[PDB]
Amino acid sequence: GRTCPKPDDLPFSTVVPLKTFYEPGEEITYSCKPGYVSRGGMRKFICPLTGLWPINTLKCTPRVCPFAGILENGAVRYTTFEYPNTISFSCNTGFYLNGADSAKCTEEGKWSPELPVCAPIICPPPSIPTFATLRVYKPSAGNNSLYRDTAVFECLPQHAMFGNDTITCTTHGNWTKLPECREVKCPFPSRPDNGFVNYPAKPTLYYKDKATFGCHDGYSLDGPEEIECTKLGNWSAMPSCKASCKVPVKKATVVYQGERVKIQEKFKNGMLHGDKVSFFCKNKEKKCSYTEDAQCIDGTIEVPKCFKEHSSLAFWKTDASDVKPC
């Protein structure tokens, strides 16, 4: 033969000068592409008189960047550390990435942008809001605090806290929002009719100050015995003394709080304001018993009209409460 044909294309290389045929004596050069290297450098060949290119031992492989699989206190994502490839980084809880979160292996076999390290998230000591004291706080990293650490505030006596009392060290190295500590006063509480109120003897009453109520005999509170001044400047509650009821019949079996009682027994000293019971009424038609409710309301309770109280003298008839349910 008289010319060499087009040279073969090796995998990650280029041939210069690339023609489709060569005269004997012409030279070509194989070079590995940028980012690749091969054993033995580049290969030059001269087209021989036979027109047959010789054997080519060129095997181009990617440069490998230095090992980068271990990020202290974090995690690298990689297939392999070869020239085309990029790796990415993240940090374990409590740490942040000091540097870029990915890097590439360059043509020159170096990492760019250059590998990061993980560092602990820290916060400076928190500031104390302007009427508050620092209840719980201990630094965990020199003078500073670590991520998810907390501090707890306590307002000064007679001051009410608006907002959560605990702050946390966040990822941004600042704390969550601080609370405020305002002074709050309450009016004096009303003495209730047929009762009395008690509260500390001082010219003015503040947040968390407490007042207690009582009722004269024949009356009970319709609210809580103790109340306190809330953060909003009013009182926890304001109960009255409501009137009890004389028991409204002499002998009857009633439902009280889901269970049968003898009303003359359970309520021998009257019924308190609010007490509900259920009286037993006789459905004369179907010969069975049903109940209907009745409540003591400030000294009044109204017995259902269907209720018939048999004097125990008339023992020849049966109480509605002894008749089978409907």
Ligand X SMILES: *[C@@H]1O[C@H](CO)[C@@H](O)[C@H](O)[C@H]1NC(C)=O
Ligand Y SMILES: *[C@@H]1O[C@H](CO)[C@@H](O[C@@H]2O[C@H](CO)[C@@H](O)[C@H](O)[C@H]2NC(C)=O)[C@H](O)[C@H]1NC(C)=O
- Please report whether residue 164 would count as binding ligand X according to CB under 6 A: yes
**End-to-end CA, the chain:** 119
CB 261 within 8 A of CB 285: no
| Residue from 142, 200, 203, 325 in contact with ligand X (CB under 6 A) | 142
Cα-based angle 145, 147, 153 (whole degrees, multiple of 5):
60
| CA 59 vs CA 5, 12, 37, 62, 80: distances in Å | 21, 8, 8, 10, 19
Site string for ligand Y, 232-251 (x = CB under 6 A): x-x--x--------------
Phi then psi for residue 238, to 5 deg, are: -145, 80
CA–CA gap between residue 83 and residue 107 (Å, rounded): 6
Three-state secondary structure call for residue 263: helix
Q: Which helix or strand (DSSP H or E) is residue 75 part of? A: strand 74-77
- Please report whether residue 140 would count as binding ligand X according to CB under 6 A: no
Closer residue to ligand X, CB minimum distance, 84 or 124: 124
CA–CA gap between residue 288 and residue 310 (Å, rounded): 17
Q: Which helix or strand (DSSP H or E) is residue 264 part of? A: helix 263-266
Closer residue to ligand Y, CB minimum distance, 61 or 176: 176
The residue nearest ligand X at its CB is: 142
- Please report whether residue 190 would count as binding ligand Y according to CB under 6 A: no
Tell me which of ligand Y, ligand X, none is bound by residue 143, counting a contact when its beta carbon lies within the kind-specific cut-off of 5 to 8 angstroms: ligand X
Site string for ligand X, 196-235 (x = CB under 6 A): ----------------------------------------
- Please report whether residue 127 would count as binding ligand X according to CB under 6 A: no
Stretch that binds ligand Y, among 90-98, 230-238, 293-301, 308-316 (CB under 6 A): 230-238
Minimum distance of ligand Y from residue 84's CB (angstroms)? 33
Closer residue to ligand X, CB minimum distance, 57 or 143: 143
Residue ranges in contact with ligand X by CB under 6 A: 142-143, 164, 166
Residue ranges in contact with ligand Y by CB under 6 A: 172, 174, 176-177, 232, 234, 237
